[PDB]
Amino acid sequence: VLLQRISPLQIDPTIISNTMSTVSESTTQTLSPASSILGKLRPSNSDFSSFRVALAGWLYNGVVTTVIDDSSYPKDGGSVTSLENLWDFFILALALPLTTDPCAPVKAFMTLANMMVGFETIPMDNQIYTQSRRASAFSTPHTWPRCFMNIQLISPIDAPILRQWAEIIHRYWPNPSQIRYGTPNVFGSANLFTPP
Amino acid sequence: TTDPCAPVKAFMTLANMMVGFETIPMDNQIYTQSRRASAFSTPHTWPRC
Amino acid sequence: VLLQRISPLQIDPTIISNTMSTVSESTTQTLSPASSILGKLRPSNSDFS
Amino acid sequence: YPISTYNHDRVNVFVANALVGAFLSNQAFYDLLPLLIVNDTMISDLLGTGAALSQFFQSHGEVLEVAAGRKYLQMNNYSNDDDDPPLFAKDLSDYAKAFYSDTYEVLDRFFWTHDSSAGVLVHYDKPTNGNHYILGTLTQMVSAPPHI
Amino acid sequence: EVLLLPIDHQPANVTTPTLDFTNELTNWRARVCELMKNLVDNQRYQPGWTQSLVSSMRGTLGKLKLIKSMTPMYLQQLAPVELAVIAPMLPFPPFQVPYVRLDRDRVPTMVGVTRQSRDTITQPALSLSTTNTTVGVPLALDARAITVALLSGKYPPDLVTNVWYADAIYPMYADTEVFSNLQRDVITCEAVQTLV
Amino acid sequence: PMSTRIAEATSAIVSKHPARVGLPPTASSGHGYQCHVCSAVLFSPLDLDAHVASHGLHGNMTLTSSEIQRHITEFISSWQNHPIVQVSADVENRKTAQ
């Protein structure tokens, strides 16, 4: 509430309605992709506290971690053959990099892999966890597949769009940085592992 | 119709009509001889048979 | 019962009727085999356990 | 494939045989097509599959299963005469199954779990496409009149 | 770890199945129909039927060898996967003999259990074959139910296997029944050694 | 008023809910909830009723109110799946009129 009441930024969700404008809704053959993402977003919601708490978690990396709700993951796995599952992949992949969770890129990669069970295959570790395990199970860093670390394990002839997805994850992920604050000379600092 | 894929749709509706008499080879197993004729609709889905 | 709950297919006997009502006939015979196959196959119930 | 660039490059014999078989059987060979020229090794292209084609070959975690068939082919004038040459059940659909892999230790660790009811045959000298085994099936030879 | 089945089982290439005829049950149905086509075509058995009824038979058999059903695709590509999933969570775990077709020799004739030793002889390898209790029942069925279940089976109009079996298999994983059975078998074997 | 009465009449006869967003259809979420004899899932508004009517013995057909409105549902679905009326609408939207 403090970052909100100090921020110059206010949100109108009506920008998305301004872009789409959804002139047709009574059809029954299917839904438009525009109407589908409007119903998926529901911009009539005006609660945005999760954005502020996700911003707040950067102060508190050390004791509390910010992960994504599994209800926002595509249920039952989800294939790429389905429109709203593709939209849910877009929502998750766009929302992800603001979190303090460490294995977020591996979540992003296995989300597309589980979207693409049965069309493009990746190499395996053993016959325990197959390709179609959920992305929600990836929390610790002992569950990252070796094909995710080494780019050359995904051959660019059987899984092309998976190869380029992992490529874009590795090259285009936002790097960390640092700034400073306060004065240590007449304050001290409660910094423990960072410089003070 | 003015779609770019009316010839391949006219071919694949016969290929979806007749099944199990005469078989043709195509690109993948996903767009098989019994895959519905309305699904192609793009130039990349054109079988080179 | 458990496999009937899981299994992805569904059985409907109406494919038999919908096809065999298009076989050729002459209606002046003693018999022609469409009524015989539908009578001896009598698929009106489901009850496939 | 042009001949000029691919003048002296290798192949998978498995991909070649399954390619001509899928072309004769009209079973959409084009996904199998770009896996023709082999990479650095012989079998890793089979393990990391381009498209899984279990009608021709399936993987089992460092052990490749293939269905070698039809060494011979019967012509219709063959009529099981004793003066006619024998066929040794090599003209049926699938007389046996072959398990190509790297090492016999890994293959026997696979045979710990695999069935071995019909017996298993090896070659031990100079195999056709790498070290493997033979798993015959229950199809029988008829062309000998007293013995089956 | 391994399970015996009467029919060849090639795994699914894709997770979106669709009808083709390249399997053993369709080949079986086609050769049976081909023989009945020869049987009506032979000039010695019947020329006695007139040409309308004859050609109606030919058309009926043509449609019968044409007929569409996803049931052979189920029995070829899917149904052992359902069997392999369900076979661990059973109160009565499987018990099989080697399947053999077309052999005088390898067909089994009996199966039997022993309970006690026959004579002063002690080793059960010496006392077994003469002293057992032959176990086994036959079980009658209906053929035409099997026949129509083979002939008329379809799928939902769109389906993907990972989503389908995920929802179809997840709710039975709340049990503790197999872990109860383990302890039951412990007390069974402990009590029989205590008895002896 | 008569106008709202005709509006609720049309919405009662035609404008029933499920517009069938395109899912991968799952076993535990299906339109046929429990086919009351066979106890399974059937996904479709004509499938569950045609299956219960298949449990109806065919030679003993009888007019019921349910028998009337199953044909009503098939008729309305046939009109809904028509390729022109799903896109045609008489009123403008300040954009098409422009």
- How many beta carbons lie within 10 A of that of residue A166, not counting itself? 26
Q: Residue B36: closest CA among chain E residues belongs to which residue?
A: E18
Task: Report the alpha-carbon distance of residue F76 to residue F12 in Å, rounded.
Answer: 12
Task: Report the alpha-carbon distance of residue F84 to residue F89 in Å, rounded.
Answer: 10
List the binding residues of F for Zn(2+).
35, 37-38, 51, 55
Method: cryo-EM
Check CB contact of F59 with chain E, cutoff 8 Å: no
Task: Report the alpha-carbon distance of residue E120 to residue A61 in Å, rounded.
Answer: 77
Q: Residue written as tokens 């398990």?
A: D99
Task: Report the alpha-carbon distance of residue D84 to residue D90 in Å, rounded.
Answer: 15
Task: Report the alpha-carbon distance of residue A181 to residue A73 in Å, rounded.
Answer: 37
Check CB contact of A44 with chain D, cutoff 8 Å: no
Helix intervals (H) in chain B: 6-17
Check CB contact of B3 with chain D, cutoff 8 Å: no
Task: Report the alpha-carbon distance of residue D117 to residue D44 in Å, rounded.
Answer: 29
How far does E92 lie from chain C, in Å, by closest CA?
14
Number of helical (H) and strand (E) elements in chain E, helices listed first: 8, 3
Task: Report the alpha-carbon distance of residue D76 to residue B38 in Å, rounded.
Answer: 43
Q: Residue C48: closest CA among chain F residues belongs to which residue?
A: F38
Contact C31, E53 (CB under 8 A): yes
CB-count exposure of residue F6 (10 Å: 0-12, 13-18, 19+): exposed
- How many beta carbons lie within 10 A of that of residue A71, not counting itself? 6
Resolution in A: 3.4
Contact at CB, E18 and B19, closer than 8 angstroms = no
Amino acid identity of residue D121, one-letter, is L
How far does C35 lie from chain E, in Å, by closest CA?
11
Task: Report the alpha-carbon distance of residue A3 to residue E158 in Å, rounded.
Answer: 47
Q: Given the DSSP bridges, would you call strands D63-66 and D96-101 parallel, antiparallel or unpaired? A: antiparallel
Task: Report the alpha-carbon distance of residue E148 to residue C16 in Å, rounded.
Answer: 9
Angle at CA of residue D53, ends A74 and E154, nearest 5° = 60
Lookup: tokens for E122: 């002690």
Q: Residue written as tokens 């086609």?
A: E30
Output the CA torsion sign for A127, A131, A132, A138: positive
